[PDB]
Amino acid sequence: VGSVAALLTVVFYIAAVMATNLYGATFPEWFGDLSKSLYTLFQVMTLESWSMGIVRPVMNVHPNAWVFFIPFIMLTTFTVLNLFIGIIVD
Amino acid sequence: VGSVAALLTVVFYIAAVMATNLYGATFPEWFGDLSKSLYTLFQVMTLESWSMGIVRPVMNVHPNAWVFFIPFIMLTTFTVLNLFIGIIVDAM
Amino acid sequence: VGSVAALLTVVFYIAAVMATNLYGATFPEWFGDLSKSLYTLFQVMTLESWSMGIVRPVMNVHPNAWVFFIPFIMLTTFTVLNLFIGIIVD
Amino acid sequence: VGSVAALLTVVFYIAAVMATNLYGATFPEWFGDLSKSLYTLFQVMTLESWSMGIVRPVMNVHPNAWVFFIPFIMLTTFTVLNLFIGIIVDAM
Ligand code: NA
Ligand code: NA
């Protein structure tokens, strides 16, 4: 549980630095700075408007952006599910 | 299960009083009164339009509002998941 | 599993008859007929746009409509979760 | 776990070929090619905007499209849930 929760903040800082870098100058509202990018990656993590709201407009500028966003989900939405199950078991 | 379900209504009254207070006069549609604030915090709890719909417009007036909304989710969306698992366990 | 799956179709016919009746003439796009009402109650069941999309516009005409929609969710989104767990166990 | 993960990519190729075929010429933005159709079926799989965003506009042209989209969900959103549970079990 402890080793998993730490890995999640590490993955969330590496993606939040990257999302600010790649889609910063192009999408300043959602990917302006690290904090802006953290808040928006979390929105994508809870699945809220992930595709139609953020993931789709970004592809219209950066067509390959799905390589960033789809794997992040297949990871973060698995991790959190595994982490929460770990809490109940322990 | 009983001790958890009661804690959920307590957390939902403390946040519903707070959400009406902080974002009331500024966002009367979603945070006008306790009932309005209860219904909207629940929308945030089920994750439905949470960010793009409510959480984002509120930050454009109250930039720190994320300190209220992100923790509420990391709590209420964990509690309900743990509560529902508790029901199934206390049956088998 | 069998006794639960049958209860779900029964609850989905009683609500689909009711939703067509209450919010029919007022909201014909989403609650016109039984089938229209079934499809829309399912959208509410998967939580997709449930509040901002359907539940909110309906309250602006029928203020108490939340008494119909919130309990339906606390039931159908629990039932399906319990049913799917039952399949994996059996 | 291995036999389930392979079945998921097989179901996702059979639907992605079909979605491109049926709703291609009519909905080129979301169902233009196999890749476009894969990405959009996945959006439907995670439930994100599934109904109000994609499933509803498509029915206004193809009224029976719900026969394609509702079963896909009752399958893919069950499979992934069962697959993820299989991973946790094959670890403890
Ligand atoms: Na969701
Ligand atoms: Na959503």
Side-chain angles (χ1 to χ4, degrees), chain A, chain B residues 1-89 91, chain C, chain D residues 1-89 91:
Chain A
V1 186
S3 58
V4 181
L7 194 135
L8 191 72
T9 330
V10 159
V11 163
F12 239 97
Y13 258 67
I14 295 155
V17 162
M18 270 156 68
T20 312
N21 195 256
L22 302 150
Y23 330 111
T26 32
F27 295 90
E29 215 110 286
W30 322 311
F31 303 93
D33 53 75
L34 174 95
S35 276
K36 268 193 210 167
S37 304
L38 282 159
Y39 171 91
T40 316
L41 281 166
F42 181 79
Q43 179 194 310
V44 149
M45 189 216 95
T46 59
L47 305 153
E48 200 289 293
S49 285
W50 85 256
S51 187
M52 293 279 292
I54 316 293
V55 180
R56 285 197 191 260
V58 177
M59 286 196 306
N60 282 111
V61 174
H62 322 267
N64 291 307
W66 71 266
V67 191
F68 191 105
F69 295 98
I70 302 153
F72 178 92
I73 280 145
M74 309 184 298
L75 202 87
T76 63
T77 86
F78 160 77
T79 318
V80 172
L81 219 92
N82 178 270
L83 179 80
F84 276 11
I85 281 161
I87 294 151
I88 306 160
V89 168
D90 287 283
Chain B
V1 190
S3 54
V4 184
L7 196 130
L8 193 68
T9 338
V10 157
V11 165
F12 239 93
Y13 253 68
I14 300 158
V17 161
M18 270 155 71
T20 315
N21 194 259
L22 298 148
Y23 332 111
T26 30
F27 296 91
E29 213 90 287
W30 322 311
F31 300 91
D33 54 70
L34 178 97
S35 301
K36 268 198 218 167
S37 305
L38 283 160
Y39 170 90
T40 317
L41 280 165
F42 180 82
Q43 178 194 309
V44 155
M45 182 209 112
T46 67
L47 306 160
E48 198 290 295
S49 282
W50 85 256
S51 191
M52 294 279 289
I54 313 292
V55 181
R56 287 206 197 248
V58 176
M59 284 203 303
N60 270 298
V61 174
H62 320 267
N64 287 306
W66 66 260
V67 184
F68 192 103
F69 294 100
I70 311 157
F72 177 90
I73 282 146
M74 310 182 297
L75 190 78
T76 63
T77 318
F78 160 74
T79 316
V80 174
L81 208 104
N82 182 44
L83 177 89
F84 277 19
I85 281 161
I87 293 150
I88 309 158
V89 166
Chain C
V1 186
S3 58
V4 181
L7 194 135
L8 191 72
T9 330
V10 159
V11 163
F12 239 97
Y13 258 67
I14 295 155
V17 162
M18 270 156 68
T20 312
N21 195 256
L22 302 150
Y23 330 111
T26 32
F27 295 90
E29 215 110 286
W30 322 311
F31 303 93
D33 53 75
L34 174 95
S35 276
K36 268 193 210 167
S37 304
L38 282 159
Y39 171 91
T40 316
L41 281 166
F42 181 79
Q43 179 194 310
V44 149
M45 189 216 95
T46 59
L47 305 153
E48 200 289 293
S49 285
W50 85 256
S51 187
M52 293 279 292
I54 316 293
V55 180
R56 285 197 191 260
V58 177
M59 286 196 306
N60 282 111
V61 174
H62 322 267
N64 291 307
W66 71 266
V67 191
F68 191 105
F69 295 98
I70 302 153
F72 178 92
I73 280 145
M74 309 184 298
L75 202 87
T76 63
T77 86
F78 160 77
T79 318
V80 172
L81 219 92
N82 178 270
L83 179 80
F84 276 11
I85 281 161
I87 294 151
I88 306 160
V89 168
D90 287 283
Chain D
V1 190
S3 54
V4 184
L7 196 130
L8 193 68
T9 338
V10 157
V11 165
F12 239 93
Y13 253 68
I14 300 158
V17 161
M18 270 155 71
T20 315
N21 194 259
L22 298 148
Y23 332 111
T26 30
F27 296 91
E29 213 90 287
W30 322 311
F31 300 91
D33 54 70
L34 178 97
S35 301
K36 268 198 218 167
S37 305
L38 283 160
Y39 170 90
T40 317
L41 280 165
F42 180 82
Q43 178 194 309
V44 155
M45 182 209 112
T46 67
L47 306 160
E48 198 290 295
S49 282
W50 85 256
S51 191
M52 294 279 289
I54 313 292
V55 181
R56 287 206 197 248
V58 176
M59 284 203 303
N60 270 298
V61 174
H62 320 267
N64 287 306
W66 66 260
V67 184
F68 192 103
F69 294 100
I70 311 157
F72 177 90
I73 282 146
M74 310 182 297
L75 190 78
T76 63
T77 318
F78 160 74
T79 316
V80 174
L81 208 104
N82 182 44
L83 177 89
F84 277 19
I85 281 161
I87 293 150
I88 309 158
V89 166

